[PDB]
Every structure is written in structure tokens, then in C-alpha cells.
Design a protein around this ligand. Structure first.
Ligand SMILES: *[C@@H]1O[C@H](CO)[C@@H](O[C@@H]2O[C@H](CO)[C@@H](O[C@@H]3O[C@H](CO[C@H]4O[C@H](CO)[C@@H](O)[C@H](O)[C@@H]4O)[C@@H](O)[C@H](O[C@H]4O[C@H](CO)[C@@H](O)[C@H](O)[C@@H]4O)[C@@H]3O)[C@H](O)[C@H]2NC(C)=O)[C@H](O)[C@H]1NC(C)=O
Ligand SMILES: *[C@@H]1O[C@H](CO)[C@@H](O[C@@H]2O[C@H](CO)[C@@H](O)[C@H](O)[C@H]2NC(C)=O)[C@H](O)[C@H]1NC(C)=O
Ligand code: NAG
Lengths: 51, 208
């Protein structure tokens, strides 16, 4: 199951430039202070089709 | 904002920002000069005294706006309409939804009743003159009033309220004119010329 696992991911997309710093906030809501906000909404700089 | 609907047709009215979550929207019908009357809650649950004509959008939809569906519009339904929005996504709104005036069309026409009143005698001994033209029961409220000094227009002192609807198709407008005691006796007879929609009607008065 492990071998098949890595073999299925060998040709797929690597996120090596997805480690750019992120700028995040809590999600769009009437926050109930108790819930910390399970999701986050984040802007980041990403490289385009050109380097 | 104004909605003009033919009589006996169906009206629709739009309130508030777009939905963000499943909502519970209230609908209020404030009649001109009166207090807001509660019309619909739970987005489609109308209380006692409200016919099944009025409808709404169920607060189960996201992305669409709050809609009020008046079926078989009648003359009494002419009013301002507000709404209170309760989105599961946005904080509690304390500013009610902005208004939307319903206008049933083709009442169609009302001739004004012009009632010219001279100054009162107790006022005459009190050294102040005031003329009271009183325009009632007209439609629509587009009246413009001029005043005449026996044959000549009067420029200053002219006071006139605004055409004000009152729990009826009927409108209302007053017209005061401040005059000096010496000139109510000096001139021959004073004229109130009320112009409405294209018809001018004039009432005059003469001193004793
Ligand atoms: C996560 O965070 C991101 C931030 O990056 C959010 O993305 C933004 O979301 C907001 C909505 O909350 C977007 O703002 C909206 O933009 C629309 C598009 O604007 C274009 O057109 C207008 C003229 O129509 C131009 O002025 C403008 O330059 C753009 O060309 C507007 O149409 C929206 O206006 C509506 O809302 C305002 C709110 O006050 C009303 O007053 C208006 O009348 C109108 O109804 C609005 O301004 C913003 O564009 C998004 N930016 C990006 C980069 O995506 C995500 O929404 C957020 N997601 C979550 C889940 O939190
Ligand atoms: C993402 O890139 C933006 C530009 O697209 C950068 O914005 C700079 O922000 C710094 C402050 O940290 C300012 O001093 C610069 O003037 C900004 N513009 C530049 C450098 O062109 C920023 O580095 C990134 N912002 C994020 C990750 O939130
Ligand atoms: C995000 O949630 C955390 C949860 O602890 C809270 O303390 C913080 O104030 C929130 N930040 C916001 C809403 O900007």
C-alpha cells in the first residue's frame, strides 16, 4: 500500500514554491468568541506562469 | 426607491444586501404618517391580520436577495416597506433595511378642494395678518400656489407646506401669507391661485 502510494504521487504536482509567507485572518462571520474559527482566509504572493 | 404597479397585478420589492447564509428576514409596512405594522417574519410566516397575498423569499437560499411578493396589489398597500435582516453570517443589524415605496398606479385623478380663509378678527386687533388657503383631496401632490394683490402677484411672505399624503389617496397642503394690517384693508380683494397638474383654481376674498 505504501509502494503504490508513492508510485501514485510520483508524476503529480509538487508544492515546493507554496511555502511563501501567508497573510491570514479568521473567516467571514459573526464570530462566536468561543469558536476560534476553524478556517482561515489568506492572501499570499504566488509565482505566475512566468518566473 | 419607488415601485409602480398596475392595479390588480402583482408587485415585488427588493430589500438589503445579498444573502450570505440561511436567513430570517422580517417585513414591515409603514404607512405615511403612522407607525410600522409588522407584516411578515420567518421570511414567509405572516401573523394574524395579514392576508396570504403578501409573500417573501424563504431564508434557505444563499446569494439571492430578500424579496417581498405582494399579490393582487390594492390601493391600501401604498406605503413604505422596510425589512430586518438576520444572516447567520453577518452580525446583528441595528439599522433597519432601507425603504422601498410602493406606488399603485392610476388612482387616477383627484381635483383639489381649495379653502381660502381671511385673517381672524382677534388676530386683526393683535396687529398681525395671515391668509390661510387650504388644499385638500388632490392627486397627485404636484401643487404650486401663487398669490394675487387684486390683480398683481405677491412676491414675499408666501408660505406653503408640502403635499402630504394621509392614510388615503388624498393629499394635503396648506398656504399661509403674512400681511401687514394696513394692506388687508388697502387692497380690493386677495387671491389664492392653486395650480394642480394643469388646472388652476383661484379663490378670492374681500374685506367687510
Ligand atoms: C477572503 O478574502 C478575500 C480578500 O482578498 C476576499 O476577496 C474579496 O472579497 C470582497 C467581497 O467581500 C470583494 O469585494 C467586492 O468586489 C466586487 C468586484 O469589484 C470590482 O468591481 C467594482 C465595481 O463594480 C470595482 O470598483 C472594483 O475595482 C472591481 O473591479 C464588488 O462588486 C463588490 O461590491 C459589492 O460589495 C460592496 C460592499 O460594501 C457594496 O457596497 C457594493 O454595492 C457591491 O454590492 C465588493 O467590493 C473583493 O473584490 C475580493 N477580492 C479578491 C482579491 O478576491 C474573499 O471574499 C474572502 N473570502 C472569505 C470566505 O472570507
Ligand atoms: C507580497 O508582495 C507584496 C507586493 O506584491 C509585498 O508588498 C510589500 O510589502 C512591504 C512591507 O512588508 C512594503 O515595504 C513594500 O513596499 C511592498 N511592495 C513591494 C515590496 O513591492 C510583500 O512583500 C508581500 N506581502 C504579503 C506576503 O502579504
Ligand atoms: C481569530 O480567532 C482567535 C481565536 O482565539 C481570536 O482570539 C482572534 O481575536 C480572532 N481574530 C480576528 C477575529 O481577527
Amino acid at each position: 500500500i505504501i509502494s503504490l502510494w508513492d508510485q501514485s504521487l510520483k508524476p503529480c504536482v509538487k508544492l515546493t514554491p507554496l511555502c511563501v509567507t501567508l497573510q491570514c485572518t479568521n473567516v467571514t462571520n459573526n464570530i462566536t468568541d468561543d469558536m476560534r474559527g476553524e478556517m482561515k482566509n489568506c492572501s499570499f504572493n504566488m509565482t505566475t506562469e512566468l518566473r | 426607491t419607488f415601485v409602480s404597479v398596475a392595479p390588480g397585478q402583482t408587485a415585488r420589492i427588493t430589500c438589503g444586501e445579498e444573502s450570505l447564509g440561511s436567513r430570517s428576514v422580517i417585513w414591515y409596512q409603514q404607512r405615511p404618517g403612522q407607525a410600522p405594522s409588522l407584516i411578515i417574519y420567518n421570511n414567509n410566516d405572516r401573523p394574524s391580520g395579514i392576508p396570504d397575498r403578501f409573500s417573501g423569499s424563504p431564508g434557505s437560499t444563499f446569494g439571492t436577495t430578500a424579496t417581498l411578493t405582494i399579490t393582487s396589489v390594492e390601493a391600501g398597500d401604498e406605503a413604505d416597506y422596510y425589512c430586518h435582516i438576520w444572516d447567520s453570517r453577518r452580525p446583528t443589524n441595528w439599522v433597519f433595511g432601507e425603504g422601498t415605496t410602493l406606488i399603485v398606479l392610476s388612482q387616477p385623478k383627484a381635483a383639489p378642494s381649495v379653502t381660502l380663509f381671511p385673517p381672524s378678527s382677534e388676530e386683526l386687533q393683535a396687529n398681525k395678518a395671515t391668509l390661510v388657503c387650504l388644499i385638500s383631496d388632490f392627486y397627485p401632490g404636484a401643487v404650486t400656489v401663487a398669490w394675487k394683490a387684486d390683480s398683481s402677484p405677491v412676491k414675499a411672505g408666501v408660505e406653503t407646506t408640502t403635499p402630504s399624503k394621509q392614510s388615503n389617496n388624498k393629499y394635503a397642503a396648506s398656504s399661509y401669507l403674512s400681511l401687514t394690517p394696513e394692506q388687508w384693508k388697502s387692497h380690493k380683494s386677495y387671491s389664492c391661485q392653486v395650480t394642480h397638474e394643469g388646472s388652476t383654481v383661484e379663490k378670492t376674498v374681500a374685506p367687510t
